[PDB]
Structures are given as C-alpha cells and as structure tokens.
Ligand binder design. Structure first.
Ligand SMILES: Nc1ncnc2c1ncn2[C@@H]1O[C@H](COP(=O)(O)OP(=O)(O)OP(=O)(O)O)[C@@H](O)[C@H]1O
Ligand SMILES: Nc1ncnc2c1ncn2[C@@H]1O[C@H](COP(=O)(O)OP(=O)(O)OP(=O)(O)O)[C@@H](O)[C@H]1O
Ligand SMILES: Nc1ncnc2c1ncn2[C@@H]1O[C@H](COP(=O)(O)OP(=O)(O)OP(=O)(O)O)[C@@H](O)[C@H]1O
Ligand SMILES: Nc1ncnc2c1ncn2[C@@H]1O[C@H](COP(=O)(O)OP(=O)(O)OP(=O)(O)O)[C@@H](O)[C@H]1O
Ligand SMILES: [Mg+2]
Ligand SMILES: [Mg+2]
Ligand SMILES: [Mg+2]
Ligand SMILES: [Mg+2]
Lengths: 501, 500
C-alpha cells in the first residue's frame, strides 16, 4: 500500500492520543515494564476493547498465568472474558508449563507455538493478539544472542499473518535496560514503557512510547492510573488550549466582592485565593459553594486540611449550612489527606467526581497542600490539569493557596501558579496599633474592571463584611504600615506673623 | 590525494553546518544511538537525498527490517523509495535472516556479504551506502574482539571501492559507552552519536559528531527534531552574528508609548514587556498585534497561557476585534500549552509558522511560561533561537516575562535574559493611598532616547492611558513608596498657621 502506516484504536483512555491513532496495524508492539506496572492489563484491555467496540476477535497467549486466573483477575474491571470465550470472540491459548516436567522446551516448542497461534488466528478469524511475558520462555537456558534471533522469528512470523500484536517483557530497574536481555527494544517495531517510578515513598505510574517505526507519537512519560475501568492515561500535553469562555457572571457569595470584581466572578474563569494561614481562605470558599446551591446549581468541595465535621461546624458558626445542601442534594464534599495518594491519583479522584455529580462550581481548598514535598514540576502539571479541565467543562473553579510566610509575602504564589489563574484574590494581615487585622484585596481580573482598593474586612457570625481602605497608611503590603496626614481642620485661625522663640 | 578532504553533502537540515560540508568522501560514518533515537531515519535520508538532489545512487543494506517494510516506513515522510528502487537509483540489500530455521547459512557470511554489497555498488554505480544495524549480525555468538576484525574488513573493503558509507549501531546507556561492544567507535573514521535524553519525563533529541578523522566539525550536542519533513537540526553556533539592522520605526499600538520611546519601536528590534502578573503585558501584547492589521501587515500571536476564545473575550473588552483581522488574513493566533512539546519543538513550530504566513510582527505571550520545568541553559539558548531568527529574517517581536515576586523584584528577568533584548518595557505595582495602581517604565532602548520617567497608567474598555509620574514620591520601585510628607506646602498664606 502506498499509504503510510495506519493505526488500530486500542480504545484505552488516553493511549489513542499519545500514540496518535492507536497501534500500527500488522506490526507487533512491545509493552515492557517492571513487575506490577500493568503490562498484563494493557494486553487484556486491548483485546477486550477490540471485542466490545469493533467486534474484532482476539487471541490471548499466556505463558505463566492460567486461563482461569486471567478470567478471574479480569473480573476486577467488570470484564466477563469467559462469555467472550463462549461467544468465540476471545480465545485464551494456554502455553504455560505443566507443573510436572519435560526436558528441552525451547527448541521446536517455539516453532510449534507459532503454528499453534496461526491455527488460533485462522480458526477464530482474530485481528488482535496479545502475548503476555515472552520472557518466561527464554528463562530456561537461553541468553542474549539466543533471545534476539528467536524473538525476531516470532515478530516476523506474526507480521505475515497480519496480526496486530501486543507482546510483554519484564524489567529489573526502572531506568535501566528497557527490557531484560537488552535486545527486545531493537527487534520490535514498537516499544512502550510502563514505569512504577518510586520517588519519595509514593508511586507514580507513567507510560512512555519509546518508538513507533513509521509514524508519529507523543514523546515522554505521561502519567496513568489503574482503576476499576482499566488503564486511564492523562495526555497532559494533548490538551488543546481551545477552552470556551463567556461574559456570563456568577456571584462569589459575597455581595461587595461581586462589586469589587465589577459584577461578580465570571463563569468561565479560575479563581485563586492566596494569603497567609488564618486570613480566611476557607471562608471565601464556603460562601462560594453556598451560592450555586441557592441558585439550584450543583457544586463540589475538596478539602485537604479539615475533617468533614470541622468543615460543617465552622461553617455553621458562619450561619451557612451544608447539611441541607447535602440533604437536598446540590452540594458534595470529599475530604482526603494529600498523603493518601500521588498527584496523578488525585487528578482522577477529582475528574471522576466531576463526571458523576456534574457540578457548576469547583472549590479545591488548598492547592498548597498538594505541593507538600511534591516536585514543583509534578505540581504545575497537576494544577494545569485541573484548571485545564474545569475550563473546558465550563466550571467556575475557586482555588486556595496558603502563603508560607505571614506578613511579608514578597510573591503571590510560591509555586508560581499565578499565571494560570484568571481572577486573583489576596488576603493579608495588617498590623494596626498592635493589632492583627484582615485586608481583602482583588488583585487581578482578566475581563472585568475590578476594584483596586486594599479594603479591611471583619468576620463574625455573618463573615465577609467589606469596609473601607487605608487611605492614611503607607507600606500596607509590608504588613506593618505607617500613619500619615500631617494636617488638621476645624475652626481657626489667628495670624500673629512672627517668631516668637 | 594531494588535496584536503572533500565532504559529500547530506542535505539533512543543519547537519552540513555541524559537519562543515557533510560526510567525508569515501569513508565510513558511525551513527550510534539507543532505541528510537533516529539512526535508521538518518541513514535512509542520507541515501534518499543523494538521489533527488545529486543523482548519486545508493545501496541500503538491511539486517533486520524487511525491504518492503522499510519502503512503507519512509512513506511517513512522503518518500517513495519503491519508485527509487524501480528506477535503479536505490537498492535495498536484503541481508535479513530467513523467517524459517536454518543455522548453517554462514561459513563465509562476511566475505559473502561484502561481495554482494560490492556487486550492488558497481551494478547501480552507487556513491552512498548505508549499513543499517550492523550490530544485529554479531548477535549470533560473537564477542568484542571478533567484531573488531569483521568490522575492519567491511570498513576497509568499502573504502577500497571508494564509497561513502553510513554504519548504524545501537546502544543501551545514553552517555556510557558509545557503541554496544565498545569497539565500533575506533574502527569507523567518523562517529555520530544520536541521543534521546530524558531528564524529567520529557525527551530531548540531540545529535553530536564525536569525531571526524581528518577535518574539523562543530563540537558537542545540538538539538534536533524528527518531523514529517525528516530530521531538522538547529545549529545555534552556525547562526553567526550577521543579521541586518535598520532605523525604520513602528508603533506599539499605544501612541503615547511611541512618544515615550521617542517615535515608537525599531523595526529590527526585540521588545520585552516585563511585569508582575496582572499588570499589563497581554494588554500591551494585544495593542502591539493590532497595529499590524491597521497598517495592513501580518501579525502572529503565540499564546501560552490563555485559550483562543479567552483572548477574544479580553480583546473585545478593550475595543480591538481579533475576528475581523483574522478574516482579513492579517492576524493569526496559535495557543498551545508549554508542556505540549519540548523547547526544540516549539522553536520549529514557530520557525515553520513564520514561513507559512510571513508576518511582520510577532508576539510571544509569556516567555516566563516557557521556562516552566526546563533548565535555565536549555531555555536560554531557546530564546537566542527565536530572537536571532526574528533578527535575521528581520521581524519586529514583542515578548513577555512575568516576574515571580510582585513589588520588591530587584531583577528584571528571573532567567536573566535582559542582555539579549533591545527594548525593555517595565510594568509594576505602586501602592498609592491604600490602593493598587499601575505604572509603565521604558527601561531601555538600544538605539533611541526614550523617556526615563515612571509614568502611571489606567486600564479601561478603550485600552491603556499613560499619565503622570510619581514626582511627589520616593521608593517607587519598591512597590510601597513614600508620600514625601507632603511637603509642606501649606496653602500659602503669610505666616502659617500656627506654629503657634
Ligand atoms: N481495581 C483495581 N484498582 C486498582 N489497582 C488495580 C485494580 N486491578 C488491578 N490493579 C493493579 O494491577 C497491578 C497488576 O498489574 P497487571 O496484572 O496488569 O500486570 P503486571 O502484574 O504488571 O504484569 P505481570 O503479571 O507479568 O507481573 C496490581 O499491582 C494492582 O495494583
Ligand atoms: N464565627 C466567627 N467569628 C469571627 N471570626 C471567625 C469566626 N469563624 C472563623 N473566624 C476567623 O476565621 C479565621 C480562619 O479563616 P477560615 O476559617 O476561612 O480558614 P483559613 O484561614 O483558610 O484556614 P487555614 O489558614 O488554616 O487554611 C480565624 O482566624 C478566625 O479568626
Ligand atoms: N511522521 C513522523 N513524525 C514524527 N516522528 C516520526 C515520524 N515517523 C517516524 N518518526 C519517529 O522516528 C522514530 C523511529 O526511529 P528510526 O525509524 O530512525 O529507527 P531507530 O529507532 O533509530 O532504529 P532502531 O529501530 O533500529 O533502534 C520513532 O520513534 C518516531 O518517533
Ligand atoms: N475591561 C477592563 N477594565 C478595566 N481593567 C481591566 C479590564 N480588563 C483587564 N483589566 C486589567 O488588566 C489586568 C490584567 O492584564 P492583562 O489581562 O492585560 O494581562 P496580564 O494580567 O499581564 O497577563 P498575566 O495574567 O499572564 O499576567 C487586570 O489586573 C485588570 O486590572
Ligand atoms: Mg503478566
Ligand atoms: Mg483552610
Ligand atoms: Mg536502526
Ligand atoms: Mg498574560
């Protein structure tokens, strides 16, 4: 064919993007990785999606696990492969060693295997093939050079059958040799790397497509997650910056804050609320979610510092109630420690809830808690992920960032997120006459006017009460101001033009 | 020969400069690299160029990939190698093992292959040869020393025919040994090393010519990009300081700013708009991109933070419509996440997007949104790439850098780019009477006078409005100034009022 390589859609969430179409049809694809990375799953989900979506028959070849365990373990994702075997759509070819014993099973055992596969293909008329762990076979007497020739024989014979094949290899070091015998990478037309990279004490699942002979593909490690729906990769780079926008205004919950912003927040905009600890970020978040519920809209709250009851207690002390909003089903709370997962996991925990409850407002309280030790690079990618998702879903997102230094915030966000967010709200402490006092301040708005005043504000049983500025103070930002006005008034005066010592 | 070493051009974009003419005539060149680097592509593109550009026939010796597979692979880049093998200009030598099961195939398999290769040379009068993956033949039972002889016999034989050859070798570690058996490097007269360096979940593709026995070459790594057009190398050293300069002026979109610059921006100059987030920038950028269309010039806005629609939402809220000038084919937005590629790729996208549309003005919103995750050096040389290209191709370019710390920042650019640009526009925050007012300063203009005052300005539905400076103040640059009393200054009168 004069056409370039065509790809077959794996229908695995994300992989079709990173691979730019799927898998090169007619060729084999090497899915290599350390233990427990999701190799076996990738091969099964590939075959499974082949039957469900495109009615393409499949053949699975196992060398270690028993077909019973394959069907058993695949029930974790809700895949009745057994039925797919019954319907003649799926065929599991058992090639795992019988527990007894037989000498020399690497000679004509492979050449017979290839013809076993060919029969399995011809009989079931299968388009997709998965061969889990081709490593176990060569783990008998063979070494290096033996593997390369024998592996090439299987890749070659498979290609002539026209099978879109997916093979599997094991590893020892995360960033060491791509495959065991340091040879499989060069024989295979396609190479895919599954990593369970440590870093700290958490684990980050990454997928990389090393090479696709004949086509294009996204380069680098893209994070993924194994869930009850299977492999889920987030192409945080294929995300097209075409997110819609609107001049429709929504309320922050605080009336004056709507006026300080030139008619309330925008619907299609991300809101950041910085400031030291204790200023009142959680409160602005509370009042924010309160608005959507009152307008018969759905809204979610993600807390990463407070308990579920301490989030209701302090809220009830502000008069507002989340109970009734939960009772009438318009408000949803999550609450989870940042250490309970990695950033790759949390992103999906959010994203999943967004599809189920389908809110109109998102309030992630404390992004600063998701930078706890996590690299500044792995963080930005996550932030952009949430922001870049809530934007294309048209959801007003209010975020929160506790500044690590009270009184003297030389920079807005210490993790340099300030560029991504549209609307910025700055809260700060102002030492007035030996007293700490709040000072709400709208700092940026990308479509509206916006007030430019550094207004003080009190909080009580009602909370956010916005008063007047500090027109008689220098160096407000510093936190330790200075009274001016060297003039007086009222009645007077005389003249007596003289000194007068 | 009594003369110097003649080099045959490879026509690989960028490689000829690095190799100072191309590959040495009648000699071998080792192109080593790990999986997915670009070895096979380099060798194919080497032969394919000689046929189309120089009418120099080529023989491609394969060891693993079947011929008919290699044919379909080159079709990725729109290359009909099936046509070239049919025209007797290219020949794919199939030395791949049979898909059956023989072992007594080679008792003289080296001298046998050489006679085959040498037969194909004189048969097609080939001047260029590419031996793809010579490693995949020693993977029978050979050791390290055994390779040194079987290579040296093949290398010497091809040198006796007088053919310029490219031998491909594979490897595991990126910076460890150069070839598999740690032998191939010294056998070949020429050593090219391809890499796919990772460094933090990304992949930078770099070429390096380790050695060229005989002549000189550019020393070190150089970033390259495998695209639809094949290999594209950026030789940032081959770009010498020879870009024309002019004195013709252009407008920033803000007429008042043009006065502050003493007549407006220079045409062949790089302008930078540094300022904390929320100052101007995108407003300044927008106004700058508008001036082209009214002057009927083409402009390109590379956005790296906001969507294509949000820009329109903000532009239409400052007057200026982007729709019309896009319909007029005078304006082009781009929009792409910084993590949607590599610095090497963004440079090529920009370079290509310039050629296709041919703009007179360029606006790259937020360079600071490109240093995200990247090292300083990889970023610094990227800036020199886009800056130098806008200079040599003679284009006015406005850039943007968001300083991390608002009010108190004592460095213009955090990544220290200052010395590269020709004009630095500075925006900042000034706390006046418990409020957040803006200010615009023209920090430098390399060839003009420019106003040296820190004027404040407003942002409205009609745009910016540069006003009066902060004369009755001090410590402006620190964000939180001083009211200077003031002063006094006591409403005139004879003796005042009291003292008392
Ligand atoms: N419902 C699920 N939720 C979360 N994780 C799951 C679920 N089902 C399976 N997994 C994960 O899958 C992993 C096992 O990977 P899989 O069986 O896909 O191939 P593998 O174990 O990497 O390859 P091999 O079987 O050759 O070692 C387990 O570590 C487990 O954490
Ligand atoms: N009923 C109330 N009356 C007066 N002030 C209150 C009341 N409830 C809370 N506050 C004030 O709110 C401040 C805490 O702010 P908020 O409850 O919004 O969480 P937060 O400051 O964002 O929490 P953290 O900084 O720990 O993340 C406290 O310093 C307290 O003075
Ligand atoms: N149209 C295309 N656009 C972008 N990239 C492409 C395109 N076609 C091929 N590539 C890239 O070329 C790479 C393949 O490299 P190449 O074909 O040079 O062989 P190699 O991997 O260097 O050799 P070996 O497979 O023997 O290790 C793939 O990783 C792919 O990313
Ligand atoms: N319609 C408007 N009326 C008044 N002021 C506006 C209007 N639109 C925007 N602004 C002002 O412009 C500022 C934002 O600047 P702009 O959107 O031009 O780019 P920027 O904020 O420098 O970009 P970045 O967010 O990347 O720093 C806001 O602080 C706001 O004060
Ligand atoms: Mg397995
Ligand atoms: Mg809080
Ligand atoms: Mg190769
Ligand atoms: Mg901007």
């Amino acid at each position: 064919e004069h056409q370039a390589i065509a790809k077959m859609r794996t229908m695995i969430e994300g992989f079709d993007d990173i691979s730019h179409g799927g898998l090169p049809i007619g060729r084999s694809t090497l899915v290599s990785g350390t233990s427990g990375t999701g190799k076996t799953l990738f091969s099964i989900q590939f075959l499974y999606n082949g039957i469900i979506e495109f009615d393409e028959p499949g053949v699975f070849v196992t060398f270690e696990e028993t077909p019973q365990d394959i069907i058993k373990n695949a029930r974790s994702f809700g895949w009745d492969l057994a039925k797919l075997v019954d319907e003649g759509k799926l065929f599991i070819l058992d090639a795992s060693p019988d527990p007894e014993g037989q000498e020399v099973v690497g000679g004509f055992d492979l050449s017979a295997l290839i013809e076993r596969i060919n029969y399995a293909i011809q009989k079931y008329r299968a388009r997709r093939v998965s061969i889990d762990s081709v490593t176990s076979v060569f783990q008998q007497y063979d070494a290096s050079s033996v593997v390369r020739r024998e592996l090439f024989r299987l890749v070659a014979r498979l290609k002539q059958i026209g099978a879109t094949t997916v093979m599997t290899t094991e590893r020892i070091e995360e960033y060491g040799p791509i495959a065991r015998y340091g040879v499989e990478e060069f024989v295979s037309d396609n190479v895919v790397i599954l990593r369970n990279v440590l870093e700290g004490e958490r684990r980050r699942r990454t997928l990389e497509i090393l090479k696709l002979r004949g086509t294009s593909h996204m380069k680098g490690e893209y994070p993924f997650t194994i869930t009850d729906h299977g492999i889920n990769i987030f192409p945080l780079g294929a995300m097209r910056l075409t997110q819609r926008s609107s001049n429709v205004r929504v309320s922050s919950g605080v009336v004056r804050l709507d006026e300080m912003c030139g008619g309330g927040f925008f619907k299609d905009s991300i809101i950041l609320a910085t400031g030291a600890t204790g200023t009142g970020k959680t409160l602005l978040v509370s009042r924010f979610v309160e608005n959507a519920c009152a307008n018969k809209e759905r809204a979610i709250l993600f807390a990463y510092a407070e308990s579920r009851a301490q989030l209701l207690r302090n809220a009830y002390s502000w008069g507002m109630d989340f109970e009734e909003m939960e009772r009438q089903n318009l408000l949803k709370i999550v609450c989870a420690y940042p250490e309970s997962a990695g950033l790759e996991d949390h992103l999906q925990i959010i994203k999943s809830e967004i599809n189920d409850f389908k809110p109109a407002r998102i309030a992630i309280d404390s992004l600063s808690a998701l930078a706890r030790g996590v690299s500044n690079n792995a963080f930005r990618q996550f932030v952009i992920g949430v922001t870049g998702y809530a934007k294309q879903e048209e959801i007003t997102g209010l975020f929160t960032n506790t500044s690590d230094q009270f009184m003297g915030a030389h920079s807005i966000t210490d993790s340099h997120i300030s560029t991504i967010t549209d609307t910025i709200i700055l809260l700060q402490y102002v030492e007035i006459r030996g007293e700490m006092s709040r000072a709400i301040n709208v700092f940026k708005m990308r479509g509206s006017w916006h007030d430019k005043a550094i207004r003080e504000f009190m909080i009580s049983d009602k909370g956010p009460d916005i008063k007047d500025s500090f027109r008689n103070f220098e160096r407000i930002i510093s936190g330790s101001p200075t009274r001016i006005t060297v003039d007086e008034k009222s009645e007077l005066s005389r003249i007596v033009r003289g000194v007068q010592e």
